[PDB]
Amino acid sequence: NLTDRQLAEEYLYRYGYTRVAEMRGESKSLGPALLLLQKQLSLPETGELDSATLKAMRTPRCGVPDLGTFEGDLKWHHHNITYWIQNYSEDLPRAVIDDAFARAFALWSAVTPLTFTRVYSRDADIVIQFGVAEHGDGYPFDGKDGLLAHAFPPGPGIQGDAHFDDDELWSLGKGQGYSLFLVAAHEFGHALGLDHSSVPEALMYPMYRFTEGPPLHKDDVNGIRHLYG
Numbered sequence: 001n002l003t004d005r006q007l008a009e010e011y012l013y014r015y016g017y018t019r020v021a022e023m024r025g026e027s028k029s030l031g032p033a034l035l036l037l038q039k040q041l042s043l044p045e046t047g048e049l050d051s052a053t054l055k056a057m058r059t060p061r062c063g064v065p066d067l068g069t070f071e072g073d074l075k076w077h078h079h080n081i082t083y084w085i086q087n088y089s090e091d092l093p094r095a096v097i098d099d100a101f102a103r104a105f106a107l108w109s110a111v112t113p114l115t116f117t118r119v120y121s122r123d124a125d126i127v128i129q130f131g132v133a134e135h136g137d138g139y140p141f142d143g144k145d146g147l148l149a150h151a152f153p154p155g156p157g158i159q160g161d162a163h164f165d166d167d168e169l170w171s172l173g174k175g176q177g178y179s180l181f182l183v184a185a186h187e188f189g190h191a192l193g194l195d196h197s198s199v200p201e202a203l204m205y206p207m208y209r210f211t212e213g214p215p216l217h218k219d220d221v222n223g224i225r226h227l228y229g
């Protein structure tokens with residue numbers, strides 16, 4: 001497999017840190033990219049490929065980049081957001097999957113002027129899809145672990161849609177597998193127009209953190225408030 005050095009390089013590149021360090025003239029060596037990463041994930045800012053940074057880079061996370069072309073202003077311009085569960089993972093019963101997504105939407109519904117209504121139609125605002133490797137959007141998944149899912153900011157077509165890597169074991173996060181409820185709640189955050197948070201305890205923190213407690217943090221609620229009047 002990849003050397004620690006190579007895993008680091010791929011991570012800094014994939015999540016947009018390499019590009020930002022290039023724009024500041026300092027791509028020659030990893031130090032500057034690592035500091036942007038340590039800042040962005042609230043790690044001690046050593047600028048070293050240290051134990052906390054390598055730990056972080058090995059942590060399963062969202063496939064959405066942390067730093068940086070879509071159409072429109074990346075918020076919804078209607079109250080009633082529709083979602084269509086285009087397909088299913090075989091990892092869970094369909095009713096449990098449907099309920100995991102309903103629960104992810106009820107989380108945001110309480111703190112936004114938006115409503116979420118399940119439909120069965122191609123034209124839903126938020127199309128939910130399970131897929132593996134290349135799955136039709138040219139942002140291919142990476143097999144088991146690493147990237148768990150991604151989503152697209154509000155707007156037309158693929159915009160607002162949420163995809164889940166079916167090379168992961170989907171569960172409710174108890175015993176084996178990733179909580180589909182917690183990953184969906186995070187990705188639906190992007191589907192409403194939220195960026196990653198730097199607050200480790202926040203839902204919109206990019207790394208997967210299993211919890212049984214209520215997942216929204218002040219920072220998530222406030223991010224939504226700074227988006228929707």
Ligand SMILES: CNc1cc(F)cc2cc(C(=O)N3CCc4ccc(C(=O)NCCn5cccc5)cc4C3)[nH]c12
Nearest residue numbers: 063064065066067068139150151152153190193194195
């Ligand atoms: C595979 N999916 C995918 C590929 C890609 F190349 C870009 C994006 C962006 C998203 C996304 O929907 N969101 C939700 C909406 C939003 C809105 C703004 C920003 C953003 O500002 N990024 C720049 C860095 N940011 C960090 C703190 C302040 C600036 C990011 C995001 C992230 N999904 C993406």
Ligand SMILES: [Ca+2]
Nearest residue numbers: 143144145147
């Ligand atoms: Ca994966």
Ligand SMILES: [Ca+2]
Nearest residue numbers: 125157159160
């Ligand atoms: Ca859409």
Ligand SMILES: [Ca+2]
Nearest residue numbers: 166167168169
């Ligand atoms: Ca699976």
Ligand SMILES: [Zn+2]
Nearest residue numbers: 062063064206
């Ligand atoms: Zn994310």
Ligand SMILES: [Zn+2]
Nearest residue numbers: 135137139163
């Ligand atoms: Zn996708």
